[PDB]
Structure 1
Amino acid sequence: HGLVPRGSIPALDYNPWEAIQLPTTATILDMSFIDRHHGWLVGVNATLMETRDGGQTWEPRTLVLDHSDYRFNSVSFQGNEGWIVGEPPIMLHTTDGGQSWSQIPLDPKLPGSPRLIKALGNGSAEMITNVGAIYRTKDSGKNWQALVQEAIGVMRNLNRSPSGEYVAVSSRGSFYSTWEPGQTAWEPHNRTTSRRLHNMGFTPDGRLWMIVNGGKIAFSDPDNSENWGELLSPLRVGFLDLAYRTPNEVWLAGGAGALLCSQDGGQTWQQDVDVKKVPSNFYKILFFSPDQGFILGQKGILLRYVTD
């Protein structure tokens, strides 16, 4: 499996990723860690699993819900306080590291369905819905206040910056929108390529990155977050996520076992050929530290970063 022919892009000398099969065929959608060893992952069909060895092994945790059809979209821990949101609207909360969980009934006025929750610690969190509504709680989810008043269309692939900014691609990739605290509305931006936008996020140096249709990426101008550099073609395949491990080491995950690494901040790319054996799209890269990282696949497949 995964034999790559001569003439491909240069190969990485080393493979730091190990494939793990979870005790499920459910697709995993998000993961969050309390500390270096204790973490949680969530996915489709209300899948919830816990690790206590840093993600080498995972155990399912039983929940008693009214049904098991929920898609758990996002999980976030800050210390022992953890939150999960999913669709159709559901929110779960823990204050003891996930020993016990409570369902927080969501106000039926909630606009759209939850797509992301961010734990801020000590009773605070913010939640974003697929229509770009943003709500903050400070009292463990009893009350929520809107942080934005207005938006356009359905958002996709929400990403949050270290300072609490958000960027989102529209549901058809025709444009993207940004928001930062104090804005009453998202601000939409026209895309700069013919190719439809698939995903966008933040670099560790205050820029945006974007993945566009046809296996191309680009980075915004440091002088001007609204000017974009030249389109790059890492593989000369569609890409699904991009994530930094360090300021200069970038990983780029795509369909059918495609996984590339750049050690020069995105200038040149090398293929991790070893993971091409694994029969899965790579949907999402999560680095929790320079040493600890996971890639979410299908059918209960994860890749785990081993420090080497």
Structure 2
Amino acid sequence: AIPALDYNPWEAIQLPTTATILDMSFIDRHHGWLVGVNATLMETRDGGQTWEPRTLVLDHSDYRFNSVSFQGNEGWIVGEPPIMLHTTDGGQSWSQIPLDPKLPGSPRLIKALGNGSAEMITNVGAIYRTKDSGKNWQALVQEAIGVMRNLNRSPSGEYVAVSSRGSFYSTWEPGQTAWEPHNRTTSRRLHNMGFTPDGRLWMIVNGGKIAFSDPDNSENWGELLSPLRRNSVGFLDLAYRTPNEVWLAGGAGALLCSQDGGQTWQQDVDVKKVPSNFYKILFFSPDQGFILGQKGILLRYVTDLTAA
């Protein structure tokens, strides 16, 4: 097979819930928040080593809290059925922000821009901005692209959305008046796309192959690569710890690391029998990162200090 990874940095944590975790965001290195299914909200004060559940008083518990975002002590959460929560004190207290009921779709993503501003993107790809803590919104992109298979953001605030069926992708950044479609080059269907730290695009396509866009001409693509060299189910997400160190997650404990920017890969065998799919990789710094699993499991990154 491909070589086994030398050191496994990932510790699987079972949170005090059976609900799937959908997002996480940090105020600073120590203080952060995670959100998920069935109105799940938890806090950390030690960088994510331990978590404290927090309950909100609501007439429903059925919310999928899909997105949480902080900029400093200002934080936002959105979910479906439509709900928006806001804090200005690091989540010590949370207020509901009413949403227009004719809002097409449901909130999918919120991004804290600071100073009372946030961008919200719906499940159908409409993009809205508030500058006044959600009291008034204006459409940045009013034409919906329909259900997105995946949605990711670049370091500079561009987004990439994979089409429902993975037949194409679209991009958007401030200044543009609608999503910009792009043809896929591969004969295979797209599963996920996002950005590298240098602002190139990456893609995961069906059947376990990946590729990277060409530096400074993102309409052309590099050659497909098979990280497992072999016929695999497929991968779910790709994320960078450092410019050279890339992780690739998928179902059933499948987790690979590359040390050369995604050219070659090694398998982290130690996590293979963790009883979870690994869906979404969130690095906050080179020594702080998480992988969201199912049913309250996540993985937490542990720097190797055995030779310290």
Give the TM-score normalised by structure 2. 0.95
Q: Which consecutive aligned stretches of 4+ in structure 1 deviate over 3 angstroms post-superposition? A: none
Question: Deviation per CA, 1:188-212, whole angstroms, max 9, x where unpaired?
Answer: 1121112111100001112100001
- The 3-state SS of whatever aligns with 2:271 is helix
Give, in whole Å, the separation in 1 of the partners of 2:109 and 2:220: 27
Cα contact 2:39–2:62 (8 A) shared by 1: yes
- The Cα shift of 1:280 comes to 0.8
Give the TM-score normalised by structure 1. 0.95
Alignment-derived partner of residue 260 in structure 2: 264
Question: Deviation per CA, 1:39-91, whole angstroms, max 9, x where unpaired?
Answer: 10000101111111111111110111121111110000111111000111110
Paired residue for 1:137, among 130, 134, 146?
130
Identical columns (%): 100
- The Cα shift of 1:154 comes to 1.9
Give, in whole Å, the separation in 2 of the partners of 1:233 and 1:19: 26
Give, in whole Å, the separation in 1 of the partners of 2:102 and 2:175: 22
- The 3-state SS of whatever aligns with 1:240 is strand
Is 2:227 aligned against 1:231?
A: no
Cα contact 2:209–2:226 (8 A) shared by 1: yes
- The Cα shift of 1:157 comes to 1.5
Cα contact 2:84–2:97 (8 A) shared by 1: yes
- The Cα shift of 1:270 comes to 0.5
Give, in whole Å, the separation in 2 of the partners of 1:222 and 1:37: 35
Cα contact 2:158–2:172 (8 A) shared by 1: yes
Question: Deviation per CA, 1:135-177, whole angstroms, max 9, x where unpaired?
Answer: 1111111111111232433223111112111100011111111
The runs of 5 or more residues in structure 1 that have no matched partner are 1-7
- The 3-state SS of whatever aligns with 1:146 is strand
Alignment-derived partner of residue 75 in structure 1: 68
- The Cα shift of 1:223 comes to 3.6
Give, in whole Å, the separation in 2 of the partners of 1:143 and 1:31: 26
Give, in whole Å, the separation in 2 of the partners of 1:22 and 1:96: 24
Cα contact 2:252–2:273 (8 A) shared by 1: no
The 1:199–1:269 alpha-carbon spacing in structure 2 relative to 1, beyond 3 Å, is: same
- The 3-state SS of whatever aligns with 1:108 is coil
Question: Deviation per CA, 1:264-303, whole angstroms, max 9, x where unpaired?
Answer: 0001001111111201110000001111000001111110
Quote the RMSD (CA, aligned, Å). 1.0
- The 3-state SS of whatever aligns with 1:243 is strand
- The 3-state SS of whatever aligns with 1:143 is coil
Give, in whole Å, the separation in 1 of the partners of 2:274 and 2:36: 20
Give, in whole Å, the separation in 1 of the partners of 2:39 and 2:234: 28
- The Cα shift of 1:132 comes to 1.1
Cα contact 2:78–2:110 (8 A) shared by 1: yes
Give, in whole Å, the separation in 2 of the partners of 1:39 and 1:95: 14
Alignment-derived partner of residue 300 in structure 2: 304
Cα contact 1:15–1:274 (8 A) shared by 2: yes
Cα contact 2:126–2:145 (8 A) shared by 1: no
Cα contact 1:169–1:198 (8 A) shared by 2: yes
- The 3-state SS of whatever aligns with 1:151 is coil
Question: Deviation per CA, 1:6-60, whole angstroms, max 9, x where unpaired?
Answer: xx21011101111101111100000001111111000010111111111111111
The runs of 5 or more residues in structure 2 that have no matched partner are none
Give, in whole Å, the separation in 2 of the partners of 1:223 and 1:162: 15
- The 3-state SS of whatever aligns with 1:217 is strand
Cα contact 2:68–2:77 (8 A) shared by 1: yes
Cα contact 1:150–1:184 (8 A) shared by 2: no
Give, in whole Å, the separation in 2 of the partners of 1:153 and 1:44: 23
- The 3-state SS of whatever aligns with 1:204 is coil
